[PDB]
């Protein structure tokens, strides 16, 4: 007997860390066998894409190694030619410990110029960034600010700003530490 | 209040060694069911970090399939209403041919017996054949491909000399050994 598709397992919110496996389950009762298609943020997922393991006729979609760009709304749609099509939408929430994508480097700078030491980070939750000089918390002063980017800006660099610096980026899942870099002030 | 029904009978799941494999045991019930999993009628051991149970027990994922995972998997659903329900399927662990002991270079005295190894693993069991030069090796009075995969040459002749490789083949993939030199010495 011909039966219009029904999605018996609505899509859920899947929480996944970067580099983990994540699976959406879109089980379908219908006759005949449906064709199941998938979108991420309303863009079609190609089912021969090697980033996915697609199984049980498209009822199972598995991301083999989750990346931040996998975050979004996932929808499965079932069509078998009978009755009205059916869809279910859930979300993939990608979490990630902090990653320092642009760490600070060694800088030789003329005194009086502006030094900007990068500390670009990625993570979810959004990492908070702080700075170490030598082995202790940076005493932020008038010339020295930690920018929204995580960069350390030092206006009018002085000889006493010279030293060893590193940045620290943290969230609930972990902490990343940049290597020590040498700031040298040329006088 | 409703007794559990497994809406997705477990199937035969094929997976290569080192692939991810998932069993889907979708259950309709009220209250929410407890689902337990057994492999070969032994409760699934979660101290093995390779297992991942998701969506309230409805998904069992093996993160990296191994030969020992092969066998019969069952989910059972209990919610304290009516009878319990069970579904059993199988995991069949497959593997492309792997040449575990390939042929090596041999210098051998004419008239001696040469045995060039080609030990393989695979599921389906790989067929092994040999290449001398660019063309397929044809067996004869002196030359036989053994059941082990080895190339056995009785009464080695000067003409037998040359470059050999073995080829291991199943429906899933083909493995080629590196070409090796059979040098025949006449003293």
XYZ file of N, CA and C in Angstrom, chain A residues 8-10 12 14-15 20-21 23-29 53 55-56 59-60 62 64, chain B residues 7-9 11 13-14 19-20 22-28 52 54-55 58-59 61 63:
132
model
N 9.935 9.876 11.353
C 9.591 9.381 12.681
C 10.570 9.859 13.755
N 11.771 10.261 13.338
C 12.724 10.816 14.285
C 13.099 12.227 13.873
N 12.410 13.235 14.428
C 12.750 14.601 14.105
C 14.215 14.867 14.446
N 17.475 16.577 15.905
C 17.745 17.204 17.191
C 18.862 18.235 17.057
N 22.585 18.653 17.730
C 23.765 17.848 18.019
C 24.892 18.805 18.446
N 25.466 18.558 19.624
C 26.662 19.253 20.091
C 27.869 18.389 19.772
N 35.588 15.677 16.085
C 34.747 14.541 16.437
C 33.824 14.124 15.298
N 33.205 12.968 15.486
C 32.174 12.440 14.620
C 30.828 12.964 15.116
N 26.470 12.707 14.031
C 25.475 11.996 13.217
C 24.080 12.579 13.412
N 23.407 12.840 12.288
C 21.975 13.163 12.277
C 21.157 11.961 11.855
N 20.061 11.727 12.573
C 19.202 10.596 12.257
C 17.843 11.055 11.728
N 17.555 10.699 10.479
C 16.317 11.102 9.809
C 15.580 9.865 9.322
N 15.093 9.058 10.265
C 14.436 7.806 9.920
C 13.055 8.090 9.306
N 12.739 7.372 8.226
C 11.554 7.643 7.405
C 10.716 6.388 7.180
N 9.435 6.483 7.523
C 8.450 5.465 7.154
C 7.664 5.931 5.942
N 29.700 10.205 5.928
C 29.267 8.826 5.733
C 27.732 8.826 5.708
N 24.272 6.741 4.996
C 23.918 5.336 5.171
C 22.426 5.149 5.332
N 22.002 3.882 5.346
C 20.590 3.520 5.487
C 19.672 4.406 4.617
N 18.929 8.085 5.525
C 18.366 8.289 6.860
C 19.439 8.618 7.904
N 20.663 8.163 7.644
C 21.790 8.526 8.481
C 22.776 9.400 7.730
N 26.398 11.220 8.656
C 27.466 11.345 9.628
C 28.553 12.237 9.060
N 32.314 12.949 9.412
C 33.419 12.142 9.935
C 34.395 12.932 10.799
N 11.193 0.906 15.198
C 10.719 1.298 13.867
C 11.775 1.100 12.786
N 13.034 0.994 13.195
C 14.113 0.714 12.251
C 14.832 -0.567 12.644
N 14.329 -1.709 12.160
C 15.037 -2.965 12.355
C 16.537 -2.805 12.039
N 20.104 -3.771 10.520
C 20.431 -4.387 9.245
C 21.816 -5.004 9.301
N 25.361 -4.230 8.519
C 26.224 -3.078 8.297
C 27.595 -3.586 7.842
N 28.012 -3.135 6.663
C 29.355 -3.386 6.161
C 30.196 -2.155 6.441
N 36.971 2.323 9.441
C 35.849 3.195 9.146
C 34.994 3.388 10.387
N 34.107 4.370 10.310
C 33.053 4.554 11.283
C 31.887 3.673 10.823
N 27.697 2.755 12.119
C 26.604 3.131 12.993
C 25.423 2.155 12.862
N 24.839 1.792 14.000
C 23.565 1.077 14.050
C 22.457 2.021 14.484
N 21.347 1.987 13.753
C 20.179 2.809 14.029
C 19.020 1.956 14.608
N 18.649 2.251 15.848
C 17.593 1.536 16.577
C 16.593 2.550 17.075
N 15.849 3.129 16.139
C 14.832 4.128 16.444
C 13.665 3.448 17.145
N 13.188 4.060 18.227
C 12.150 3.464 19.064
C 11.024 4.467 19.321
N 9.786 4.048 19.068
C 8.600 4.831 19.436
C 7.965 4.277 20.713
N 30.465 4.960 20.704
C 29.747 6.215 20.921
C 28.235 5.969 20.854
N 24.463 7.453 21.184
C 23.825 8.768 20.980
C 22.302 8.702 20.859
N 21.670 9.872 20.921
C 20.206 10.020 20.844
C 19.440 9.019 21.703
N 19.516 5.237 20.750
C 19.021 4.875 19.426
C 20.117 4.750 18.381
N 21.266 5.364 18.648
C 22.434 5.278 17.767
C 23.617 4.690 18.485
N 27.464 4.032 17.528
C 28.539 4.256 16.600
C 29.840 3.648 17.094
N 33.691 4.150 16.405
C 34.468 5.269 15.844
C 35.593 4.823 14.913
